[PDB]
Design a binder for this molecule. Structure first.
Ligand code: ZN
Ligand code: ZN
Length: 54
C-alpha cells in the first residue's frame, strides 16, 4: 500500500509505503529502489516481512 501527496511549500511530492502484511508505514525515501519496487500482481512486503523467518 501507499499514500502520496504534493507539498505546496517545497513543490515536491511525498509518499509513504505501507506493508501489505504488517501495515508498517515507511518513508518512501528511506528505502532503496529494490525495496520500493511494486508489481500490479502481488503484495508489497516491507524489509522486515521480506527478511524474517517463517
Ligand atoms: Zn515539502
Ligand atoms: Zn511488513
Amino acid at each position: 500500500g501507499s499514500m502520496d501527496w504534493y507539498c505546496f511549500e517545497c513543490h515536491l511530492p511525498g509518499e509513504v509505503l505501507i506493508c501489505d502484511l504488517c501495515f508498517r508505514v515507511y518513508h518512501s525515501k528511506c528505502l532503496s529502489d529494490e525495496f520500493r519496487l511494486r508489481d500490479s500482481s502481488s503484495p508489497w512486503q516491507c524489509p522486515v516481512c521480506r527478511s524474517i523467518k517463517k
